[model samples]
Target: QPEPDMITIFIGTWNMGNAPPPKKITSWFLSKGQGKTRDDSADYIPHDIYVIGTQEDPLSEKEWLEILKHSLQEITSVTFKTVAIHTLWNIRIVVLAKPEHENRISHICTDNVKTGIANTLGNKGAVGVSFMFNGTSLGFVNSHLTSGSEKKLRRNQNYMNILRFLALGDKKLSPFNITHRFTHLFWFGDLNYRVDLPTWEAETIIQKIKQQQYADLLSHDQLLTERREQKVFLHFEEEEITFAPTYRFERLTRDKYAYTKQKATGMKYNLPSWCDRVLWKSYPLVHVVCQSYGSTSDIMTSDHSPVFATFEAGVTSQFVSKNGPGTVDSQGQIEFLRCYATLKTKSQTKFYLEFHSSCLESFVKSQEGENEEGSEGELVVKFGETLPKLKPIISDPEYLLDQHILISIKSSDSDESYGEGCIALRLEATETQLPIYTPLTHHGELTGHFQGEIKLQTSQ
Candidate 1:
């Protein structure tokens, strides 16, 4: 019962470099300098939510998940359950929560976009998961950007492609961008932004880290420069980095950077950089307090050290009522009015019907001259892509009797309106034998036509 009004979130990012899981990773979860097993350390606090992101991960989804679950359980007494997970190629993002609060979470969705070779391969890209937690919307993105010290602009392009294309939602609804839809967003992983220094200069600064001189090296960090100039992560904020650079480390070494590289001439020094990061953003009115941000050095399985951050967000509401019509209850609280129709139009562009109401919504795509059923009517001109079911929340039916279901036809590619109409709810007839045609208009100009056969059926 720690801070019941605030939800503590633990976010971690690591680039495993395709390495196998380490023998022991208990230090990766609990506070540093604490014992590997659970103990009565006064500073250690169990987080309410854990969101982990990894790039270049070696294990399959199931195997990696099993290891993570086991590691979390081994370090603490908290019982957690995996709520949502998404993986694209080697990039994966996982969301976990304590079982006591699982009932307050819902509307889980996932999406991914490729930024690798020719934008077709999954070698580099982002994977995202968004869901509603006690009325607040949260999204987590795990990305692996283009590497190399000279390709900073390419990394910016990778970030833009993910922000524009990645969508999360159910199949029956339209996909929405995570940044615009969620109240809080956490973007973390192997971003691969390097230090703006030559091999000799970077090595000189790396040596000074032993004397605790960090300001000089951080001034030339490429990620900070880009963020200050509004190139990438314009809205996101990262805490001041106090730890040394976490990249270009020699494998199986505790304090050595990977500077030696075999080349045609001879072995050369590679510039040590900080490529791993954890960043977050929040909308106005939502308060987020970052308590700790650091990297763990005990695990020596890969070339990059693991980064972790802890945050506490105020939970203002008990539960949220979302925009889309929710699932029907088992007590038959509502009934669906099924509308099957043929839509006729000259344009071959993709089009879909949008049914919007205060408590109901559905999207149905309509195609031209495609009949799966041989029952022909009206020359088989146009028909719906699928039968859309619209069930309004009934206060036993009184709340739905006078309501109107607004229907609009629009192009899928371009959101141009084709036509618009409304269906008035009534208890007169349970089924209609006659087909109804409604004309759609935009700004009082007729754009298209819609036809549908209506029937009502109660949920049993």
Candidate 2:
């Protein structure tokens, strides 16, 4: 058996500037099987995996996913399936892998952190997707940092906040910090760090880019300066950039940076900057090598050009069992049963219960159908009535491990206050049935009781 095998991962990050998706982007996605090439290292081949992330995406989550799925399917022959996906308002991250390797991938999970206004909104933040692929834990995160030529400190703070708050996988399955939770990590997005030079001088240097001279301008890149000073993105590695700066371009015009004032706000123009970037870090034992780094200039759907990188990541083989490549291990779902709640206050009133889980949200929001009665992952209850059984179709069983379920209680007669309760159920394949009973508290006082049972089963 080989000690390690290599799989190619193609990752791209684009800030659409709230623009609509084009009919086709053949120039950006150019993966074809066995393209004409003399150098073996330069030969083009279809990637085993793909990760596409976007900022300021205008379409719905379901529609944005369809665009990505269509783009990949139009260019490649390999069949792909979504391993994990998550969206935080304008920030979205989607991971796709070949169907043949589905059995080898497990423990798929996703999470997002808000760093927008007051650190509570989703305007500026990150979406993360993580899973174990062929014995290697892989993490992919796409972020949109605070945008301003003078807000370098704010961008650095955004990086730190994402690192500290973003958690991947279940609490029982993986650690909380993404930096320490996964074996390999790929981070890409519109970082929004500007070039620290006068507008005229920066314009002159950007003109030199046409002459294939980047060293003079690359020195003023704020992202690189931060890395050198160790203020952010510590120990991360990025391939040498061979493309021009990707930001502040004139819409519908090629090779021209937008230096004119904004029409809507009449604000000062932006300095040309290499805002979009891709970086990676991995364990010493794991070999993660960048094969290509580039930006698509022809796809002009946004003011910022799309940036892409391809890498060869290490993977270990697993022993095949009688279950045929262990694919049975990949099939399982969860069911909630006998949901009931009791309130201590008596006024002939009905009690409403709400359930929220990040694990369930990651799966349900990606679906095309939306529940009209309530948002995804919620339940309703009334006095003397047992709530209906909830049998949410869960695709991954690992999501159930350390899954948190929150119940908020509100009385029909009283609109002044509500109580909250929570539980984290660590599920296992061996134990399928579990009982739950948690007390609801309002301002540190017991107000109600919640009871439920969960059934986990594996299907063929």
Candidate 3:
């Protein structure tokens, strides 16, 4: 009942340095069953779940989500569908389940905490979400830590502060011990740890790595060393990096070192080091395997190169649903409807709607064809008829995660809830950033006799 042993997730991360995402990320993506690159037996099946974290002033929005979809489609030529989303303080995170596998990802919750300037600003912090995919509980975190190459100690402190940063909230989903709750945890971002080597010594190591010895510098990596010393993140395991340093690059100079940066940072030659990373921790259930860990030099916009990793982990198709274990709809999808918020609350300058008729806010973006044929992003949002008027706004409005769209007596003057639909607000799940023109209905036949009675919490 605990482990499904029948499913897997394909996850990766990148720090965009605040630049817009590339038209296509050459950031090391591989299908789940695909072997190493150039293998004769390389089979390219679309990875089931895609989770990516990025930082550069809270880069999670509908626009950015759309760009990712476009870029990813350019990468694999396959659509990676969306199921859920989360945005914490300074970083963004989202999980996309490939076609036919949406229901395998559920029970999603995302939370974050700020370590920027006494824990109030949404700058230096971690944002993450947890959900069940195929019965195995999983958690993923995207964070930006104290920005200094030698600030390893501060980075360590940041890690502990975030471990308690609940993906939901205090008394909600606190102290997200990835080793404790989920079978696997992926914690990644611009951790800001530097190489322990002096510039002169680093040149030697870099040369050796150039000669195809990548793991040569790991023992000297500040983060890895700290982990070995038990100073931080004890349970998490990282795929050995085969790529060079992903951080501190010269702007627009592809493959060149940071080239004459300040020497105060622990980096040697003020040299580059792999700062952007994707590391995972697994306990019990299905072990997570790393297919590849590397970065792309193609993205030329930021001081940091994009880093990515592909992981194959065991999850389940037998997870709980309203229908129970091995539960699925007639189409074999796990859940009927799932939409997650992509942009973190702090990222948006404007949040919350002024309550216009059709002015709508599309906080998170999901693409379909993009999705499945059966449960294609249709929700039965029952609006109270007498009070019902349809105003579907295709806007990037302000919306905190707590608000839910449901039915009311007529218009919702109160912050309460209800269920089912008077309107079949079914938008085709095509993968695009376009607005969905949906219609609404009102029935004067709906009388005050329609007291908003809470339906039974349990449905058969």
Candidate 4:
């Protein structure tokens, strides 16, 4: 079969603390060969890529690596490697890829400052790495936030700091900033933020980035329904199956008092309402095809089930009209001009060359000037001196690369006419830079054509 221009990436967060191996792992792999099996059918198909978690402890990391390596070897044309390791806390990130795409591998580990958020609990945990597929860059971050009282807030603050750093920080000051070029930025893991209770207070973080436009990959209507159903049985169920719970305790019978008294059942094992989730930015080349939350009855490795998604790289059509209201600000115009000039120069870096070419195409096609029947009257309006001088907003610089910069021209008229003189542009930068170690110089090295349509109004 021919290769697909679109590629799927599989991500899972598992809490495999001090548990013996189960037979389900092998059975799970076998089932993937068969078609349309379970609610987790997506997992049954051979995944082009695989990312596994909770192998941070040296012992567990070693064991998990061996198991994964052997499993992948059985599947011809696939290769696997451990990209990042948080050895102190038994957390590890492993990447599985097809042999043809092996050269695209780049491991990004957040420095101590970012890792400190997960480590603050005094347990080892991991977060944040960059992955690329067919030239699209994605930053994947997995974190196990603190689960207690006031301390939990501190953990949230720490992770928020890391997120702010990623969304707005500079590369020179933060190593994680290197992942800025990723078109899609995903922050997932055992966030420990409960949807039912106000206890987990990361709402502020969610609100902060709401305008930034990162979609919660797992936040589909169907999935949200499943979560609500699971919450109703929180106390009665032995294990929470619907939600993605990646944390589990060993020796279920160890301590009677070990379990919280508020909702204590003498049952040896405890499964709370926690879930492993993915938060991401929506871009043209990203779409969620399938996702599920459940256990592989065949693999009883841990109590917490894995949450997985199959994502294809492609573009989504823009719903917001380029000529829509409030389309451009004073600063946006200046940025567009600067970008226009940089793009016009032929000798610019590959990044700017690709970006400029696409923008110019979109600008030419989307504006009324390109169409023969449209009047040129709208283009002649001069801005009054009173117009404010646009200056760059000191946003999180890291986000600037993958973030979309929309540029539009409004004819200073109160009712902005769509076809005659209005113009709008939608642009996205490459997500992650190729590491210096490899021949590729930056992540998400600019590729693909800039896309848009021109709308012209006939004076009729």
Candidate 5:
């Protein structure tokens, strides 16, 4: 058996304010890395890498890096450390791994690249990072696309330039082969694009991207169980949904104020739509397993619940041992048979006997008209002949006919309407010659006279 290669990436956006009067959330986030006595076991376990965005403070990012280093020292299990800070905004990418794999880790930012249309945006400072693992490589771009007309055209041009840089080779950029090595690319952050527009619609850019192989990871397939039941897209297949809103103006607590006061007012807070999306390139090497989608209370976390997934680089079963029946020795076989016999006596015997009798009856009936058949030939008995007797060893007063007897008889009437070849005989005690209490019943008609035979059997 070989160990499986798996990786889990935790992507989230946190707000880190510039001033400390309100106490930057990044300070608390950094404190976890220090042996500063905290309990996150309930909500968060130690992760291999943590990518955070929306930090407006440079000092906070520095402090976060320091805390991450301290955390690596405190938790000896994870030793490798790598951190990148975006120059344009407050976004950070942290990579942690085992010490042995530290040398394999590599990353490059998009702003440094000079090529294609993205070079213009790179000159204007766009933020992105590229990381490579063994043979597979991944790139994460924290983009802030155009929001309004003032910077809209520049942002769109920058966005297109970034895409072109990633597609074609850029000299100043990271040595990433978008056609080859950079096969898996994840674009996260606020794109401000609506996904619902039709291809011909003038506004929908996602429609154009989706037309290409790149698809939203969250809406890849319907949930497995949901598909089994309703057969609809019950599960989060590719992350597109109509009227599903992600932004709202809700306060963090009763005493706290609304994060986005103006945006929350007048807008219906109920409808959640996907404004920010996480997308991936269309490639065989990339596969995602989503663990969850929404918040615990249907509320937003940092204006978005944060789409999360687990990635598997390779395949392997967890079972360590072979599966099959164990080898049986002679003694073991005998013990098994003994157990089987006891089981049969308690329950299986009746069912087995009934099934066997039904099979035998079917066999006899199948050869009814045949001139030569074993069942038809064997059933022969003379009229007024002494019938076979069944005797019981016990002296129970109510014992009927001493024991049960099986009899096969044939009808004497020549007409087919009359009961034909059949089994019949009076059940009686061996010594008393008394007829047993037999229930009267009709058997299939027999046209010709046939002989009969009786067999006695006992049950305890």
Candidate 6:
């Protein structure tokens, strides 16, 4: 087996341009050099993690998430799961990783900074997530900044603030800022910086890329120039971009530059710009190697094509490869769960983890509601109570993986006052709606004592 310290991650950013994500994004997910098959035993396994960014109206942000969930399942045969989905207005970022690494992710948190107008609209913002990945502190920032040459300075300002101010929950995450907070940093999304040349001149330089003289274009990219002048993205480095421009392409086909004649001239959009990109800054504790950087051609739903790259992260973790929590604080043993009854629906439903507290509470929160956070990954925490002659239910309608018997603290100590005879609660998906919690058969104070939840244990 490859050393446990090593991990592979694939990152992609596309301005979905308010379009619906396709049914199967496997091709978009896989690197161009990899094959169509899935082989875990290979010398170079497929990515263990995926970070995707979307720009422009994302339909309230949930559709793109569901698309990734189903598509990843379809692509990896259920080996991977959507663990994080954070959005700020038109910009959204989602992260998916192998199931076994679920527990290994802790100190998980997300935050966004708006730079649109007074930054009131989430239209142009950055959604960031940070966690401990196999003993290494890491942060991923997906941002969409102001467009145009004059706004390049504003874009850099946006980058500095968003990267500088990150939080774990309600408070700023200690070790704030991208360059210093983590051992490895992944910064990507539609930065909206233009080329130093006019649209036609830039296109002239762009078209010559096929003629073996493309390096000049990179020199003219505003972002690169900014970096070279030490004006922005200071310490980060990007892989040598040898692919076509990833932005403002004609929706029809290649060679058609996205442009505008007058106010609505060609009906095309902005001048072609390499606006979407992925770059990283790393420390000695973690070694990141960029394998590829390019854009995809098959997708027509967006004027900006998807830009992606892969990396191999080699760290030092003795037991990182062993089957356990990806992070230390996670409930390593009962990481799965307990409880089951039956599905009387038209078809049987098979279920596995639909309750990862971290993913649900942090990533998938209510778009408008007050305490609205949710997801579909189960991590059964021990309960203090068991059966109190609880009556048997007839249906476990949600088909689950391994007859999942979910046992979790219905309410944390802070949520509910604990005292003598406190009744422990369990989850039972109602016939008409999704699962809700109620007192289990043995309604007693959940027994165990952890950091937050009252210790609870139950059995059939």
Overall lDDT per candidate, in order of appearance: 0.66, 0.67, 0.52, 0.36, 0.32, 0.55
**Candidate 2 vs 6: which has more lDDT:** 2
Q: Name the best candidate (by lDDT).
A: 2
Candidate 2: where is the Cα deviation over 4 Å? 1-4, 31-44, 117-122, 170-176, 263-266, 319-460
Instruction: Say which prediction, candidate 2 or candidate 4, comes out ahead on TM-score.
Output: 2
**Which run of 10 residues does model 5 get worst, by summed lDDT?**
333-342
Assess candidate 4 and give its TM-score to the true structure. Answer: 0.50
Q: How accurate is candidate 1 locally (lDDT)?
A: 0.66
Tens-digit lDDT track of model 4 for 1-460? 3335456666655555446555335434432311122334333356566665543223566676787777766643345555544333655556556665665554344432243533344653444566444334555656665444324445445454545444322232221232233455555555544333232323432342233332342232222443345421111111123422233322332111122324343332222334455445434323444433333333334544344433444422212223322242122221222111111112211111111111121221122212111142211222222222222221222212222322222222221211111112222222221211010111122111122222111111
lDDT of 3 by residue, 1-460 (tens): 2333544455656666667665555444542211122222533555667787778734557876687677667656778787666665547887777666665566777777788465535478888877766545678888788776557888887887777544431122111233344556788888877777775675676576556565657767888888888687765688666666776776676656663545544443445666787778664324567776666657767777766666777653342234322222221111112221111111212111111111122212112111111243332222121222222222111111111222221112332211111211122222212221111211211111111211111111
Candidate 1: worst 10 consecutive residues by lDDT?
A: 329-338
Query: Cα RMSD for candidate 4?
Result: 15.8
Q: What's the distance in Å from true for residue 401, model 5?
A: 78
Regions of candidate 6 where Cα sits further than 4 Å from its true position: 1-3, 33-44, 116-122, 168-176, 200-203, 209-213, 261-269, 318-460
Over 1-460, each residue of candidate 1 has an lDDT whose tens digit, in order, gives 4324579888888999789858887666764521122233723466778888998899888998888888877766666899888898899998989887788788898889899575436489999888777646678888899887778899988887887677763333332334434557888889999888777676587786667677877887889999988778865789888777888787787588776566821464457677888888765335788776777778778888888877877553332133223553222222222333333445556555566544343444333233222243221234443544555443333334434444666666687655555454543544443344554444323444456555543232
Clashes of 3: 18
TM-score for each predicted model, relative to the true structure: 0.66, 0.65, 0.61, 0.50, 0.40, 0.62
Q: Per-residue lDDT of 84-118 in model 2, one digit per residue for the tens?
A: 77889888888888777777789888899888576
Candidate 5 residues lying further than 4 Å off, grouped into runs, are 1-4, 14-47, 55-60, 67-80, 98-100, 107-125, 148-158, 166-181, 194-251, 254-273, 292-310, 314-460
In terms of lDDT, the poorest run of 10 residues in model 3 is: 441-450
Displacement of the residue 1 alpha carbon in candidate 1, Å: 10
Where's the lowest-lDDT run of ten residues in candidate 2? 363-372
Q: What lDDT score goes with residue 302 in model 6?
A: 73
